[model samples]
Target: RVAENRPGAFIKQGRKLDIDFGAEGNRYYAANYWQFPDGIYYEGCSEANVTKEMLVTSCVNATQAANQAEFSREKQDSKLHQRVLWRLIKEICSAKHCDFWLERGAA
Candidate 1:
């Protein structure tokens, strides 16, 4: 999927940030804030200009907000989680011994 988007892309290293911090999930506001974690502000539909750096900072800033929100809400305690998938792929003009192929199937 990454290749289809980026013709020649490779994963160099895992991101410096391992943990993901964001808002608490709310079913009532799921449509608007589904991308965010659980209690953080997610004004995605707003006309504000959002940037990659801002998104990253929002995740960082949400940690404390999520913590405080969790304290007020009653639910199972769960830690923040994030996953990083890294697979190095390079394009070759004249190459051999490459048996790997991208797989496509339903989850």
Candidate 2:
């Protein structure tokens, strides 16, 4: 089973469309435009970067593009989403090349 309530987990605070990521290889990884709540997605295939930050930037910018995308969902938000770092033990990310921020802390 997946670790649910642990220290420094991604707490679902505000409106978060399911993350849809695609990667043919580490260097060509990126996310596709998903309309979960509408007008929210990411694109990085054009550039020569395959970092998670692209996803963050795309959604964050898109959120504002559709400023009306919210509800009492309006009542909740934060300065940052992935605040903690290490999340749900995902691997295969360049054990010697790619840089990962999600480091399991004391957990």
Candidate 3:
């Protein structure tokens, strides 16, 4: 579990609200689909406190896992891994404000 931020991350109000909903929606979807921690961030109930770095890290991690699973011995063809990564990317892209952070400064 990550330590809580005292005040919260600097984020626009509308963006923060959307993020909160998006996070929860995705969390539920992931849970229902048995994705677990693969495509969700358990950062409490407030998206207002989430940092850009954290979201970016989640995206990067998911993508990397998908790439790795392409050749992983556990499953030669991991559609689940592919779906998880794709779902993460899709969520990030659909977000109004948080999407920029995912690709910000990224080549």
> Model 2 off-target regions past 4 Å?
1-41, 69-73, 76-107
Error of 1 at 21 (Å): 14
Q: What is the C-alpha RMSD of each candidate to the true structure, in Å?
A: 19.3, 17.0, 12.0
Q: Rank by lDDT, descending?
A: 3, 2, 1
Steric collisions counted per model: 7, 2, 0
- TM-scores of the candidates in the order shown: 0.22, 0.25, 0.25
For candidate 2, write residues 32-70 as lDDT tens digits: 112122222223234335455554444444433433333
- Cα lDDT tens digits, model 3, 54-102, are 5455544544443443335434565444444345444542342443233
RMSD of 1: 19.3
lDDT of 1 by residue, 15-100 (tens): 23222222332222233322223222332222335444444444334333434443344234322212111100101111112233
C-alpha lDDT values of all predictions = 0.28, 0.29, 0.39
Question: Model 2: what TM-score?
Answer: 0.25
Which residue pairs in model 2 clash with each other? Answer: 71-74, 86-102
TM-score of 3: 0.25
Q: After superposition, how far is residue 78 of candidate 3 from its true place, in Å?
A: 2.3
